[PDB]
Amino acid sequence: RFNLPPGKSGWPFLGETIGYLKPYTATTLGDFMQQHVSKYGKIYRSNLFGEPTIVSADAGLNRFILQNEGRLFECSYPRSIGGILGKWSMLVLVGDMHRDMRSISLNFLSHARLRTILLKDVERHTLFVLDSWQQNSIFSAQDEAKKFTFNLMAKHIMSMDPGEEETEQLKKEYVTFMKGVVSAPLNLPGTAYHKALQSRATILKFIERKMEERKLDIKERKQRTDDDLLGWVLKHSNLSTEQILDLILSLLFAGHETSSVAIALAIFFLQACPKAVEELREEHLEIARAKKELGESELNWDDYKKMDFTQCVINETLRLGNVVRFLHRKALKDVRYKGYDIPSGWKVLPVISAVHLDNSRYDQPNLFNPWRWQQQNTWGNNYMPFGGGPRLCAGSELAKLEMAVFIHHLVLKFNWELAEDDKPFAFPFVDFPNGLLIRVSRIL
Numbered sequence: 001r002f003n004l005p006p007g008k009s010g011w012p013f014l015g016e017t018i019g020y021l022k023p024y025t026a027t028t029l030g031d032f033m034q035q036h037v038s039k040y041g042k043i044y045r046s047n048l049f050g051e052p053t054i055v056s057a058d059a060g061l062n063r064f065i066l067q068n069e070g071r072l073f074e075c076s077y078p079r080s081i082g083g084i085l086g087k088w089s090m091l092v093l094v095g096d097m098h099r100d101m102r103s104i105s106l107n108f109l110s111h112a113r114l115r116t117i118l119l120k121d122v123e124r125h126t127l128f129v130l131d132s133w134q135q136n137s138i139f140s141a142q143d144e145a146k147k148f149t150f151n152l153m154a155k156h157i158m159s160m161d162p163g164e165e166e167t168e169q170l171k172k173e174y175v176t177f178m179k180g181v182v183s184a185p186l187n188l189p190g191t192a193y194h195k196a197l198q199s200r201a202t203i204l205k206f207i208e209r210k211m212e213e214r215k216l217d218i219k220e221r222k223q224r225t226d227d228d229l230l231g232w233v234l235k236h237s238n239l240s241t242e243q244i245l246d247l248i249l250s251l252l253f254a255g256h257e258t259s260s261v262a263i264a265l266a267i268f269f270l271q272a273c274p275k276a277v278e279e280l281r282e283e284h285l286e287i288a289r290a291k292k293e294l295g296e297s298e299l300n301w302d303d304y305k306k307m308d309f310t311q312c313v314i315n316e317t318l319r320l321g322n323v324v325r326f327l328h329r330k331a332l333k334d335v336r337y338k339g340y341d342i343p344s345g346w347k348v349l350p351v352i353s354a355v356h357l358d359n360s361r362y363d364q365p366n367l368f369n370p371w372r373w374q375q376q377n378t379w380g381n382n383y384m385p386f387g388g389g390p391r392l393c394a395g396s397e398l399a400k401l402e403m404a405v406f407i408h409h410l411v412l413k414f415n416w417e418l419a420e421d422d423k424p425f426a427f428p429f430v431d432f433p434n435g436l437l438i439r440v441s442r443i444l
């Protein structure tokens with residue numbers, strides 16, 4: 001009756017989940033996806049995570065899925081997300097409650113707030129990390145990136161400063177909590193889920209205590225009470241305690257996991273594209289030399305808009321690295337696309353990273369070429385690293401600012417090279433198996 005996309009169901013229980021989760025180099029789609037697209041085409045069926053699933057490497061189909069969030073498709077991630085991130089996190093909320101949460105999230109990340117608060121902390125925390133590097137020393141660029149993004153997010157969310165007692169204790173506790181979501185079940189035992197569950201409860205109690213402190217700050221009419229998400233939400237919304245807790249915790253995870261891997265990806269690519277670092281250094285030299293002319297030390301929004309080639313490397317980094325491999329969706333209706341039926345209730349996985357590596361939309365897609373973006377543009381459906389539609393990444397602008405400011409001072413202060421062989425891998429979460437060990441050398 002239905003003209004389902006071609007494919008197989010795999011093992012009766014496991015389906016094709018094992019093969020689908022098999023690690024692969026992050027600059028490709030993997031042998032599993034590559035072979036399935038070659039045999040069945042860009043739209044095929046499978047059984048993944050216990051559900052009959054339609055896998056889409058089709059750019060047009062993926063844009064259609066993303067644009068019709070709430071109409072024909074619906075966010076539907078495995079229960080691990082809802083269990084760890086909370087039933088009030090944006091990833092498990094749909095409808096009005098997701099609307100409110102997303103608007104609260106965007107109201108806090110408004111352009112005005114992104115132009116003042118967030119910008120200074122981004123450069124502030126950027127130098128805090130970069131100022132401590134020492135040349136000829138071999139350290140993990142991945143660890144350092146993670147330190148930058150966590151410090152920054154902890155500041156924006158709860159006004160927590162790097163180096164405090166509660167900050168370092170939060171990082172240690174967050175390690176265990178984070179594995180409940182980003183972790184390879186093929187690697188990590190199931191026990192980790194319950195350990196991640198008990199660290200979530202621990203972090204929630206901490207967040208609630210800080211909520212009580214901020215509530216006393218607001219009661220006593222103390223200034224700067226909107227500077228962190230916790231304070232802003234208390235004054236400018238009527239969320240409950242449970243909803244605030246989930247919001248702070250999920251956003252910490254959201255802002256931290258993606259940003260750190262993005263920055264680490266830029267560091268990896270640039271190390272192999274000296275020409276891009278050379279031209280990057282000129283772009284930021286003539287931006288800084290113009291800052292000294294005015295006796296300026298802090299960055300302002302205008303300096304950011306002057307970085308046009310960094311926005312190219314950013315696009316090229318997200319295009320090639322693919323922080324997010326695919327999204328989880330569910331069909332709300334019987335849907336037809338390119339003569340293929342997607343029956344209601346079926347899982348649908350838009351592989352948003354597929355178009356980025358399609359050699360019919362990009363010339364030599366597996367080559368890090370930042371200059372392709374003076375030709376190409378981010379309109380259409382050739383570029384979708386942040387998803388799209390009603391669930392377009394609400395922090396995409398902050399993430400680009402994070403990458404821009406960090407590259408700014410990074411190229412100004414150091415050259416760098418790979419300390420040992422290392423490639424990004426998708427587990428499907430992107431990670432450098434050897435920590436991306438690098439070696440820097442200051443410039444003169």
Ligand code: HEM
Pocket residue numbers: 075090091102105251254255256258259262318323324327328385386387388390391392393394395396398399
């Ligand atoms: C390189 C950086 C980033 C990438 C590639 C990225 C990617 C994505 C993608 C693909 C989605 C769609 C998920 C879905 O619809 O199922 C998404 C959603 C989202 N992202 Fe990001 N993200 C990045 C950075 C950030 C940051 C820094 C934050 C917050 C501080 C953030 C917060 C969110 C939120 C809240 C959503 C869901 C919004 C909604 O449900 O309406 N992201 N992101």
Ligand SMILES: C[C@@](O)(c1ccccc1)[C@H](Cc1ccc(Cl)cc1)n1cncn1
Pocket residue numbers: 077081085089090091181182250251253254255257258324393
């Ligand atoms: C990378 C991400 O899609 C993901 C990670 C692991 C498993 C499934 C999805 C994640 C999804 C998410 C979005 C909003 C909130 Cl509040 C919390 C999480 N994310 C998006 N942007 C930043 N992180």
Ligand SMILES: [Cl-]
Pocket residue numbers: 007008009010
């Ligand atoms: Cl079958």
Ligand SMILES: [Cl-]
Pocket residue numbers: 009046047051052053
């Ligand atoms: Cl099936």
